[PDB]
Amino acid sequence: SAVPFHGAHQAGIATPVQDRLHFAAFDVTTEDRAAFVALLKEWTAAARRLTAGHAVGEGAYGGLPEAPPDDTGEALGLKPSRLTLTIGFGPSLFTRFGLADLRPEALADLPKFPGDNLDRARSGGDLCVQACADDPQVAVHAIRNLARIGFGKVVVRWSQLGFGKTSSTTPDKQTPRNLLGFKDGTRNIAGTEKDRLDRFVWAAEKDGTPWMTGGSYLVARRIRMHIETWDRASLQEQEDVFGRDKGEGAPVGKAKERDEPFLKAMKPDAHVRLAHPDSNGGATLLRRGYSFTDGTDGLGRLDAGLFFLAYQRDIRTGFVPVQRNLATDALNEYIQHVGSAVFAVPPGVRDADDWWGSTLF
Amino acid sequence: GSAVPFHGAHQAGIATPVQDRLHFAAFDVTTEDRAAFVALLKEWTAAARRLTAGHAVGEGAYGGLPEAPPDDTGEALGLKPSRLTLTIGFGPSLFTRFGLADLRPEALADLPKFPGDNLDRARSGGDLCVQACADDPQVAVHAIRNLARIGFGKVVVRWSQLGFGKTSSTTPDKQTPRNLLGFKDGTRNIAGTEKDRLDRFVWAAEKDGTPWMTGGSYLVARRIRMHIETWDRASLQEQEDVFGRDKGEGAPVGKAKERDEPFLKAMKPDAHVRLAHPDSNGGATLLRRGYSFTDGTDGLGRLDAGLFFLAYQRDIRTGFVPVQRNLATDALNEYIQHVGSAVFAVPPGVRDADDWWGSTLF
Ligand code: HEM
Ligand code: HEM
């Protein structure tokens, strides 16, 4: 019902994937290093409260009537809902506070990719807060109140709501389906594989940046789907595009979803074949993305897709090689990348005296 | 995650207990062929019966012929009904087609201008709507999407709104949710069990003058933006004065419990509850059924939050219109703005497996 906030790593990466997401990117408006560390400390205290289901500060009510409530109150009466709050630092942040020489080399700028159609307003950002919970209102309440505490020092650059499974009605032992209708997440790094997380996800001290040990690197991509075009393709084109059948999610020529794939039975430009580590030098990713549907656009189409989030030990050896291998993916007919950002995700908050970003500052 | 019965004298999704998620879509009809339109209404109803029971539309989501697109888009496979409801409504603009002019109900009143209005006409109006409510947003989206797909050619989506969480209650035995202003919303509503109050205030009656509408209702949708920056810097006393209830318990001012009856003369002359209360409006009562939304940022460094407000009533002219008029001096006005609007006549329920949506109009 709650997920511990403290640890060697930040929660919300290897911890169980919650039902809903509210992802927020912030831009820093202050030049004062001290004012910013002060904010980071205030945020951590508030995050401790929020992840345990308490209001921030003095609470949402019952204080001096002449004062605004410390907490906007829309979460009163709700449970922690497995809220986790993960903070990340964007490349642009390291142009401030004299941190230029402390940018990790592993936090590489993404190249341009064939087909990219990036909306500059929903891209990048100085920092991010990933808010995962089973209740969308708990997640939003977290983002809202963190933005309120930071007003005057950070502004909200862009924001994205997402949903995955609804765990009160869907079994834990069941792969969710994305909005194209295929099972999503079958071949992924699991939170249980400590060895795989150490190899592919967590920054090692010998990786070159000491203050990032225990951290990870995050790639965010807002990926629109062309729903109405996808929905007119035959059942067979859809299955050809991924290399798995729609119903069971089995690799072509196998019987069960979790049969290991035989890559040569797939079409050379099938998604799974091109994304598989065997096609990419062993490059392996922890995917933790969410579906989104924001409404309908100007021509009556559904503005929906996948808010793709990947964690990895080094952007140069994780996302970048695999995304590059998708240049000729058959899926590309049906999707379009319209938003992008990278963040260095610092190590965890070790105890009640620690704070977000303490190793960097 | 059980199913809600599709068949009834009334459409589900009104007096029904309020489900967690909303996906509301308004459609414009692009066909002139009345017969084409009736066939669509029949096909939509057949799809709805599957969808509300948790079944794939048509022949299913896979295992049909390889060379043909699957009948169901597939993203709801293996999910429970999730209390899905599908509620349909006809906008006034529809009665200018298929020779329905004479049949437009008198209670399908057009709304006047209200002070403060700033209605975006692209996200307003519409020939008809489908209100999709469920506890799982993937289920709600799958129903809209698949309904939109079946209607390709004869209807298109004029605008849609998702609500990520409810701000209304038709079950006063369960906890009242809060809106994005932090207040409990829905304490003094109409409960799905109060048969008397639903007949008196929500269901259209035969004598009301439109026979095909008997058993149906009238729906007002108002998209309402909240100025949360302004609100979040107001004192707690300011906030509690705006409504007339306290923030924590949600009790009428001066009283101790959420559900104690308000004593209106103890509230400010411009408190929201005082002005909205039926005693202040000649007994007018609404069924509120709204949902919160947030659509990203406003591009000015802030979250964009609001409330998608839905009211069902027996006659718009005796329901929303007088209560909205009385809010002209509401203290809440300083913190909100109405930015979208639409009215719909909601037909009666689908009686059985042989009936269909709008059969009493067509
Ligand atoms: C709308 C966009 C996308 C959709 C719908 C999608 C969908 C899928 C599906 C259905 C699978 C098979 C089941 C699974 O193992 O999860 C899969 C596998 C995978 N995808 Fe994607 N994907 C998308 C974008 C991407 C991107 C941008 C990347 C990397 C840059 C990526 C990397 C992978 C990887 C590594 C696998 C596991 C392959 C394996 O080892 O079997 N996907 N994806
Ligand atoms: C964002 C806009 C609005 C907010 C935040 C809001 C909030 C509230 C709150 C906190 C209450 C007290 C608790 C309750 O009994 O539900 C309430 C009651 C009520 N509101 Fe609003 N409301 C809004 C818009 C409207 C509109 C547009 C109408 C009608 C046009 C309306 C009509 C009513 C009514 C009839 C009641 C019940 C009053 C009673 O009988 O005690 N509200 N609302």
**Do residues A20 and A135 make contact, with C-beta atoms less than 8 angstroms apart?**
yes
Q: Which amino acid residue places its CA nearest to atom 7 of ligand 1? A: A184
**Do residues A36 and A358 make contact, with C-beta atoms less than 8 angstroms apart?**
no
**B107: burial class by Cβ within 10 Å (0-12, 13-18, 19+)?**
buried
Q: What gap in Å lies between CA A275 and CA A280, rounded to an integer?
A: 7
> By three-state DSSP, how is residue A145 classified?
helix
Q: Which helix (H) or strand (E) holds B225?
A: strand B217-226
Measure CA B316 to chain center: 14
A251: tokens are 């690799």
Q: Which helix (H) or strand (E) holds A155?
A: strand A154-163
Name all residues whose Cβ lies below 6 A of ligand 2: B 179, 181, 183-188, 222, 224, 226, 243, 245, 262, 272-273, 276-278, 286, 307, 309, 320, 323-324, 327, 336
**Do residues A30 and A153 make contact, with C-beta atoms less than 8 angstroms apart?**
yes
Task: Tell if the CB–CB gap between B66 and A234 is shorter than 8 Å.
Answer: yes
Q: What gap in Å lies between CA A341 and CA A328, rounded to an integer?
A: 22
Ligand located closest to B272 CA: 2
All residues at 6 or more sequence positions from A34 whose CB lies less than 8 Å from its CB, including other chains: none
Structural domains of chain A, count? 1
A–B interface: beta-carbon pairs under 8 A: 184
Q: CA-based angle A128:A134:A137, to the nearest 5? A: 70
Q: What gap in Å lies between CA B91 and CA B110, rounded to an integer?
A: 10
Q: What is the DSSP letter of A252?
A: T
Residue A237's CB is within 10 A of a number of other CB atoms, namely 16
- Provide the residue range defining the domain that includes B73: 1-362
Q: Which amino acid residue places its CA nearest to atom 9 of ligand 1? A: A184
What does chain B come to in residues?
362
Nearest CA in chain A to B23: A295
Q: Which amino acid residue places its CA nearest to atom 1 of ligand 2? A: B307
Measure CA B233 to chain center: 30
**Do residues B143 and B83 make contact, with C-beta atoms less than 8 angstroms apart?**
no
Give residue for tokens 């879509």: B25
Q: Mind giving me the DSSP string for A49-88?
A: HHHTTPPSTT-SSSS-TTS--SS--TTTT---TT-EEEEE
Question: Does residue A92's CB lie within 6 angstroms of at least one atom of ligand 1?
Answer: no
Ligand located closest to A338 CA: 1
Q: What gap in Å lies between CA A230 and CA A185, rounded to an integer?
A: 20
A161: region left, alpha or beta (phi > 0 left; psi from -120 to 50 alpha) = beta
Q: What gap in Å lies between CA A256 and CA A250, rounded to an integer?
A: 5
Q: What gap in Å lies between CA B80 and CA B83, rounded to an integer?
A: 8
Q: What gap in Å lies between CA B13 and CA B87, rounded to an integer?
A: 6
From the candidates B83, B120, B178, B300, which should be mutated to test the interface with A, based on the most A CB atoms within 10 A?
A: B178
Option in A65, A163, A227 nearest B236 (CB): A65
All residues at 6 or more sequence positions from A281 whose CB lies less than 8 Å from its CB, including other chains: A321
A201: tokens are 């996800």
Ligand located closest to A337 CA: 1
